[PDB]
Design a binder for these strands. Structure first.
Ligand SMILES: [Zn+2]
Lengths: 96, 220, 59, 60, 49, 107
RNA sequence: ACUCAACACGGGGAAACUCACCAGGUCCAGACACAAUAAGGAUUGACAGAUUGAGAGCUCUUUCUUGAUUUUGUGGGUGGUGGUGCAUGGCCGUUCUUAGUUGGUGGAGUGAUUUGUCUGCUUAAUUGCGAUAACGAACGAGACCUUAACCUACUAAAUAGUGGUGCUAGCAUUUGCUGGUUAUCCACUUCUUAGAGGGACUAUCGGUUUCAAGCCGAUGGAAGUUUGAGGCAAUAACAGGUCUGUGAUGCCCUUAGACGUUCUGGGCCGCACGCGCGCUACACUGACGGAGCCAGCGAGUCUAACCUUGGCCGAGAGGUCUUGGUAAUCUUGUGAAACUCCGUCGUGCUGGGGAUAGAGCAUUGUAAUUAUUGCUCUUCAACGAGGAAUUCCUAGUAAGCGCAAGUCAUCAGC
């Protein structure tokens, strides 16, 4: 899908920060709840990461639940040029 | 918000969670969930069999759930706190057995071995009765419904709600979809809470053997 | 206008139309065989007792 | 109609065998006895038991 | 790519399955009648009489 | 400031009668133990939420209906107590599935 | 979907949506991998006309904008209210809510199997008595659970209610009688609420039978038809229904000029006619006008326009200014309808009946035309108790009668 580089980067940054993203299955929603981008871009960005193994998706009650995988952490680290050290929120003492 | 609306919304919150974890914690052997609403926090307890690798890695792939929970339902980080908990009586959990049936049927243990396998595992561990029904396509085109009953179980009345634990799962495969039905009666003697018998079960105590005749034989 | 429905092929409902039928082999390969019942049933107690050993060793 | 099931008629015979000494030909005292000596879960069944128990005691 | 969707069956869909038909709105449920009977006891609606 | 006696309404709402009676009993007993002025647990009429659906997911069969009920039990207890004791009473009686609201009576 | 077990059923009351159908137009929301193509721009965009229902840069005119996302092929996905319910899951309907089902030990039989599980009487009941090569049991029935009827007995309560008092208004003198002031206040908990417990077991007596199970009469009692009503409901089955509830699903079909999706308009309502559920009627036990005037179950908005009181405007529908209510508190005593009284008519298609139809004024909504709906006047049809047939029904029941809820922006003959 054709997507602005800015919006794509915002989604990748969010996903790396939190390690999870929750998107309602609404392609017409003008703005995503947690990210300043169109909800369509979130769903289609993460669909492209899931097809490559980088993100695991679960779908329930018209919501997509995305969880970042180990391979996805590495990919996003390279893509964002982040310098080992900085992990995602899912490595900060999870417990739930 | 009204109380009529609020308690219903807490019902739908539970129901959304139960269905979420069912498909998320499929491999990790999810029994169920309970929630305890306090003023500050909201406690949650994921009961599960495989409680080792649900947690793991000093937490690396676990709170994904809570971050997913806090994200959707609009909770702060400090409020909601889940817990992993070792499930008690793996046999009597009807959900666990129908889930275990799936994994046996996936790696290709044949129906009768799988069914009799699970029935005997239940019936050993304290269970007054059991049932397993498997329905659907299995290699033949026409579909059929085999039953694998053992022991004793009632069917009608309020005791069903009390004792017997129903659970169902849908299992995917090359040819069609097959469907499982694990009733497990549990013994009223091992109650914990509630009544300790069936309503029909009358019990009589035997009288002590009293000696006839006797004398006055007074005391002071 | 007056002519009612002309059935809905209910007179030959039990008689299959495909023409294909299931052999005894296909049924038995899916749903297990009645001759080889002991082999299946004896392996169940082995599979059952395997899990009970793992359940016990959790002190 | 009023026809009593097995569990009524069975447990009535089972009480009378053990406690024909004790019990009377009167419902009210019997029902209060059936609480102590027998362990019945239900309240309605207890009143059924004790009622047939009284019917048999009348015949004896 | 969009038109009025403020009222009517086009607006309201099921929480679970995204069907417009046969909704239960009472008490702000928004669950289709079929899905309700599945998730009735889970919510806390139990049969009695 | 702490010793100022405030008139307070504790409202208890639950679907489960047993838990709600236990919590209600514990609040009343604790109020007695501290010699607080109590108006006892007023039982409000139980709200029966009723949903009637067709049993069948399709058009077929006899027109059979199912009726589901959710019962909401509501109680309130009025207490005259200082602020410190009230905070103590509310914290001790948190049972899962009982909702507890505290309203300060300002006229 | 087509006998019971299709046909006011799909919670199916479709103005758009819903939506699947029809005439037309967009968008790709075409994952990924590989190559092509390639930053001396792969490729999105868009004013004004042209074009088109259209302010859709869709396409065309034209010359900017953008900086590798993609486009273009090749595999391969994704979605599908596309097909098959005769490939399936789940669910539900039916047989059957009928009374039915099974094994242990013993007996009979080489065996499959059988008896138990029965001639009779009894029960709502394979419920029991009794008969008895069976004996003792289990599932189903029953018990249970929810609900409805009693409990001057307990437990308490202004978010329920009463009795004096504080208070205050009128009638009347006799203190009174009848009302305001919901915490000015005190005391109770009968009525009301719901929490524990009690109460019924065919109790007790009289008949009539294998003097058994039972049944029938009479008296107490709140209640004596399983106390009334449901819920749950065995072994099984059916090529019952549902792939148009589902991100339940196999396979097949389709996949950029789409059977994906979305926008505009139409259609689902279209009318020589045949059938099913219903509403309103045919009048005098009635219509009409005034007056009297009594329920129960409900439901209801916080960042949303929900239930609406009271005042004011209006013939009415409605409008309008404020207020209570997240609700035993406010709406609401839901002063519902039939009915009750006193009037008006007088047996005539009549003042019974209110179809069809004209004109106007409101309301909801982006939109009311193929009348959404309501209101005013006018128009005033068939129908004089329904042929052959055929449905439902045994006590607070049938039938009459309206009300709330569901759906719901609006619309009930359901
Ligand atoms: Zn749904």
């Amino acid at each position: 899908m054709l997507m602005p580089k800015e919006d794509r980067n915002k989604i990748h940054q969010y996903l790396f920060q939190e390690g999870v993203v929750v998107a309602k299955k609404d392609f017409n929603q003008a703005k995503h709840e947690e990210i300043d981008t169109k909800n369509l871009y979130v769903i289609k960005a993460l669909q492209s990461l899931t097809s490559k193994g980088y993100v695991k998706t679960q779908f329930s009650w018209q919501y997509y639940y995305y969880t970042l995988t180990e391979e996805g952490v590495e990919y996003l680290r390279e893509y964002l040029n982040l310098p080992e050290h900085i992990v995602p929120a899912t490595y900060i003492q999870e417990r739930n | 918000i009204s109380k009529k609306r609020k308690l219903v919304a807490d019902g739908v919150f539970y129901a959304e969670l139960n269905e979420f974890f069912t498909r998320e914690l499929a491999e990790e052997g999810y029994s169920g969930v309970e929630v305890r609403v306090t003023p500050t926090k909201t406690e949650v307890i994921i009961r599960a069999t495989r409680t080792q690798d649900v947690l793991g890695e000093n937490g690396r792939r676990i709170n994904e759930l809570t971050l997913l929970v806090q994200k959707r339902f609009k909770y702060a980080p400090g409020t909601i706190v889940l817990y992993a908990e070792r499930v008690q009586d793996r046999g009597l959990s009807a959900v666990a057995q129908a889930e275990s049936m799936k994994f046996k049927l996936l790696n290709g243990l044949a129906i009768r071995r799988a069914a009799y396998g699970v029935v005997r595992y239940v019936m050993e561990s304290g269970a007054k009765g059991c049932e397993v029904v498997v329905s659907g396509k299995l290699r033949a085109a026409r579909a059929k419904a085999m039953k694998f009953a053992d022991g004793f179980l009632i069917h009608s009345g309020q005791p069903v709600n009390d004792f017997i634990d129903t659970a169902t799962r849908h299992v995917l495969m090359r040819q069609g979809v097959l469907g499982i039905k694990v009733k497990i009666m549990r013994d009223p003697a091992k109650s914990r809470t509630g009544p300790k018998a069936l309503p029909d079960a009358v019990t009589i105590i035997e009288p002590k053997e009293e000696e006839p005749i006797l004398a006055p034989s007074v005391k002071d | 206008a007056t002519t009612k429905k002309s059935n809905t092929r209910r007179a030959t409902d039990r008689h299959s139309r495909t023409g294909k039928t299931d052999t005894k082999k296909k049924v038995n390969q899916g749903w297990g065989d009645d001759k080889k019942e002991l082999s299946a049933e004896k392996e169940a107690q082995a599979d059952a007792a395997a899990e009970i050993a793992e359940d016990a060793a959790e002190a | 109609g009023r026809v009593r099931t097995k569990t009524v008629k069975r447990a009535s015979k089972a009480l009378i065998e053990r406690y024909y000494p004790k019990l009377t030909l009167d419902f009210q005292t019997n029902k209060r006895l059936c609480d102590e000596i027998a362990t019945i879960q239900s309240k309605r069944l207890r009143n059924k038991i004790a009622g047939y128990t009284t019917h048999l005691m009348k015949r004896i | 790519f969009s038109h009025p969707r403020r009222y009517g069956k086009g607006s309201r869909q099921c929480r679970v399955c995204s069907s417009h038909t046969g909704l239960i709105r009472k008490y702000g449920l928004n669950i289709c009648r079929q899905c309700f009977r599945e998730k009735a006891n889970d919510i806390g609606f139990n049969k009695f009489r | 400031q702490q010793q100022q006696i405030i008139k307070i309404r504790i409202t208890l709402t639950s679907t489960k009668v047993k838990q709600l009676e236990n919590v209600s009993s514990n609040i009343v007993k604790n109020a007695e133990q501290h010699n607080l002025v109590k108006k006892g647990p007023v039982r409000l009429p139980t709200k029966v939420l009723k949903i009637s659906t067709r049993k069948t997911p399709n058009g077929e069969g006899s027109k059979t209906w199912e009726t589901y009920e959710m019962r909401i039990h509501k109680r309130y207890i009025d207490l005259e107590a200082p602020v410190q004791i009230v905070k103590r009473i509310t914290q001790i009686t948190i049972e899962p599935g009982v909702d507890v609201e505290v309203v300060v009576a300002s006229n």
